[PDB]
Amino acid sequence: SIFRCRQCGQTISRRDWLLPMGGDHEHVVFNPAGMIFRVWCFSLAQGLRLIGAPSGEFSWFKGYDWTIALCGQCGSHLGWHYEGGSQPQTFFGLIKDRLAEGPA
Ligand SMILES: CC(C)=CC(=O)N[C@H]1CC(=O)NC1=O
Ligand SMILES: [Zn+2]
């Protein structure tokens, strides 16, 4: 079972790659613009384009800096890559409702 970009079908991640950060792969969070995201943490993802330099500002995950992750194919905002932390150093937080799940 794999996750594709809902807008264009780009291959992004797999159910096998889910990561229970702080005990749960799912985290419901809001940014400073008041947008709610249901974020699923993954150890790995592909097919993204990470934009800009990392920032710790308003990070939802203690110890991690984030970079915006777009679908590399269509440019849809799919979530964030997190880095600079520990155990693990890096991971992806993807917006669940921007993905489509289906057969490998
Ligand atoms: C431009 C956007 C859409 C930024 C954003 O929402 N950043 C998240 C990432 C994070 O961990 N905390 C935030 O506020
Ligand atoms: Zn896409």
41 is in an annotated binding site: no
Nearest to 18 by CA among 43, 1, 39: 43
Sign of CA dihedral 6, 11, 17, 19: negative
Is there a contact between 84 and 73 (Cβ–Cβ < 8 Å)?
A: no
The CB of 37 under 6 Å from ligand 1? The reply is: no
Q: What is the resolution of this structure in A?
A: 1.8
d(CA 57, CA 61): 11
The CB of 55 under 6 Å from ligand 1? The reply is: no
**Ligand 1 centre distance from Cα of residue 29 (Å):** 9
Question: Would you list the domain boundaries of the chain?
Answer: 1-104
Helix (H) or strand (E) holding 82: strand 77-83
The CB of 30 under 6 Å from ligand 1? The reply is: no
